[PDB]
Design a binder for these strands. Structure first.
Ligand SMILES: Nc1ncnc2c1ncn2[C@@H]1O[C@H](COP(=O)(O)OP(=O)(O)OP(O)(O)=S)[C@@H](O)[C@H]1O
Ligand SMILES: [Mg+2]
Lengths: 320, 82, 149, 59
DNA sequence: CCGCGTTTTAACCGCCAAGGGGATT
DNA sequence: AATCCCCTTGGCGGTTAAAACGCGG
């Protein structure tokens, strides 16, 4: 329903055609007044797509408002430098250093147009949320969404109630472990909203999502490939379609070389067999998970418990 | 509320300052990498300073009949000097 | 031995530092030139040693910690990766492969996973590829800005 | 046990050896018998040794 | 004496897995 | 009287916030 938007006049670079396609998709997402999840593969330049989106919003519209970027520290420095390289048109504030230096970076920050975008860190904002919460954010971007993949984690709780117009997640893959991560990301994009004292929900709840979706997916994973199964997976695909975005590396990167997978089964040794049997016998009746970790340590190497002794002579204290 | 034209002017000033910072960063990075390479080279050059050195060399030497004749002539001249 | 004979350079990915120490002892007995990356590595030291491994062609085996791979770094110079033990999170193994198989690579890579027969490692591998099956059903369905066919 | 970082005779004299490991470093003073054992093992800086205190064996 | 500029590090958060409580209908 | 949130624990990897710090003057 959209087309290639004009390249920003303030964008200093040469994006690829598919980069422009992603930029158009994000532009459509913002113009739809909605939020979305980026799930494109690594190396494609999710940082580049984010800076391109910022440039588009600034250039076409008046969308130059304060924007929040949260990144892990090393990737934070890399992001800041890459932001300088691609689109230096925004006076970027780098949150960094000792708390005194943090206060110094803060001084006089409320003056309009003193900064255009701020880059912060996940644990840094987890500690210093009380400072940031006061001002709303025009456009929020969440790099490395796998860091907030846990709904239980205090990071998700701290970042959940933030006041912003539109938000964007960046992840290589939204589902590392289970459907719970998927729900956490989705509901982070579309949480409950309050208007005139009412409770309005954007998405369903975690228990609601798992009840209405996960059990059919549990049946899916129970047995490989059943009209109900196909209907359920199609329903999941169609509900996930409007908010996801992912380009596979295979088709876009046609110059990639091949890959092969190999499996080798290694037999146990006598010491390993004895230690494994003893630990399993002790664990049959204590806690069970610590015993599982000990069994894995047996499987790794027997030296993790006791090394073979360095035999040496007994020493008498004093001769007769 | 500053207008979009004044906004673009401020953005251009920011672009100029950012270009300055970027070239400074590039120079710093080049300096760091070159210094690391120089330190590695200095580590590789660990030897006695300004001392006399005795060297023993053995190598395969190519020969031609003209060179053999020249060597024989040198031997004959040395014998004549004797 | 086969990898060194074929001229390939191997990458060892493990889960705990004690296995790193045991592997270091083993390959020191066998005389393989190597370098090790651990969690305690400093950021500048991490980058410098990554560059050293990429440039130097005399170190056949390079040892990583699988968990530390969450912060990715370019390691295009590899030619084969060996997984000494498996992890519960398949995305961690995916990014570990990414460290060796990424954009700019021009050599075909091989994946080796080590498991112990009739033990728990089979269960870990089952959990890993079951999660990968769930990942496949959620990913493989086309959503790359197209619906026509 | 550790990597030798110093071999300084105290002057048949005691030797002051500095052992480094992955968790810490330590400097010790060894009796002349241990010094003779180290001397005949051709231990230099950068070597890794193994001194058993009870028996005075150096490997 | 007091920071300048510094390095190290203690201490806490995410794992990440299979049960196992003990509060709720 | 049958089910959810936290427990329950090894070894991992980040990652700020004091400890303890030459030195400059
Ligand atoms: N259009 C482009 N022009 C120039 N360089 C580009 C372009 N697109 C991408 N790049 C380069 O590709 C990289 C993109 O940034 P990255 O952060 O490495 O990508 P990425 O999406 O973050 O991959 P991951 O998921 O972080 S491993 C940078 O090194 C850019 O210089
Ligand atoms: Mg990234």
């Amino acid at each position: 329903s959209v087309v290639d938007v004009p390249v920003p006049s303030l964008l200093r670079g040469n994006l690829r055609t598919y980069q422009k396609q992603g930029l158009n998709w994000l532009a459509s997402l913002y113009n739809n007044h909605t939020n979305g999840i980026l799930a494109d593969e690594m190396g494609l330049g999710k940082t580049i797509q984010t800076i391109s989106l910022l440039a588009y919003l600034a250039c076409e519209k008046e969308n130059w408002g304060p924007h929040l970027i949260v990144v892990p520290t090393s990737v934070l420095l890399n992001w800041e430098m890459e932001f300088k390289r691609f689109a230096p048109g925004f006076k970027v504030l780098t949150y960094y250093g000792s708390p005194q230096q943090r206060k110094e970076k803060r001084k006089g920050w409320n003056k309009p147009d003193a900064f255009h975008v701020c880059i912060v860190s996940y644990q840094l904002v987890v500690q210093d949320q009380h400072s940031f919460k006061r001002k709303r954010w025009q456009y929020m971007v969440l790099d490395e969404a796998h860091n907030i993949k846990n709904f239980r984690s205090t990071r998700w709780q701290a970042l959940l109630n933030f006041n912003t117009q539109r938000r964007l997640l960046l992840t290589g893959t939204p589902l590392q472990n289970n459907l719970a991560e998927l729900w956490s990301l989705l509901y982070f994009l579309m949480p409950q909203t309050v208007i005139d004292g009412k409770k309005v929900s954007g998405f369903a709840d975690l228990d609601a999502f798992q009840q209405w979706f996960g059990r059919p997916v549990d049946k899916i994973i129970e047995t490989g490939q059943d009209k109900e199964t196909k209907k359920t997976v199609a329903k999941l695909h169609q509900v996930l379609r409007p908010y996801l975005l992912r380009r596979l590396k295979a088709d876009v990167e046609k110059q990639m070389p091949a890959k092969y997978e190999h499996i080798v089964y290694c037999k146990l040794s006598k010491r390993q067999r004895f230690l494994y049997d003893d630990f399993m016998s002790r664990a049959q009746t204590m806690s069970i998970v610590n015993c599982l970790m000990q069994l894995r340590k047996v499987c790794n190497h027997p030296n993790l418990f006791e090394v073979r002794p360095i035999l040496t002579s007994f020493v008498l204290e004093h001769c007769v | 509320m500053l207008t979009q034209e004044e906004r673009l002017r401020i953005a251009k000033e920011t672009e100029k300052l950012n270009i300055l910072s970027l070239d400074k960063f590039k120079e710093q990075e080049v300096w760091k990498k070159e210094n690391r390479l120089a330190l590695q080279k200095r580590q590789k050059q660990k030897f006695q300073p300004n001392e006399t050195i005795l060297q023993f060399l053995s190598t395969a030497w190519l020969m031609t009949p003209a060179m053999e004749l020249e060597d024989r002539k040198y031997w004959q001249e040395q014998l004549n000097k004797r | 031995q086969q990898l060194k004979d074929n001229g390939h350079r191997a990458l060892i990915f493990t889960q705990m530092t004690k296995v790193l120490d045991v592997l270091e002892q083993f390959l020191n007995y066998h005389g393989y030139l190597y370098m090790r990356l651990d969690g305690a590595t400093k950021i500048e030291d991490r980058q410098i040693l990554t560059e050293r491994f990429n440039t130097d062609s005399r170190i056949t085996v390079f040892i990583l910690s699988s968990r530390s791979g969450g912060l990715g770094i370019n390691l295009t110079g590899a030619d084969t990766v060996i997984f000494y033990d498996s992890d519960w999170n398949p995305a961690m193994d995916k990014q570990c492969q990414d460290r060796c198989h990424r954009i700019g690579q021009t050599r075909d890579v091989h994946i080796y996973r080590f498991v112990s027969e009739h033990t728990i490692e089979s269960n870990i591998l089952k959990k890993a590829n079951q999660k990968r099956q769930l990942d496949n059903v959620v990913i493989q369905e086309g959503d790359f800005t197209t619906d026509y066919f | 046990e550790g990597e030798v970082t110093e071999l300084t005779p105290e002057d048949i004299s005691h030797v002051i050896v500095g052992l480094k490991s992955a968790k810490g470093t330590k400097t010790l003073r060894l009796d002349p018998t241990i010094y003779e054992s180290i001397q005949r093992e051709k231990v230099s800086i950068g070597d890794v040794i193994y001194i058993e205190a009870n028996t005075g064996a150096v490997k």
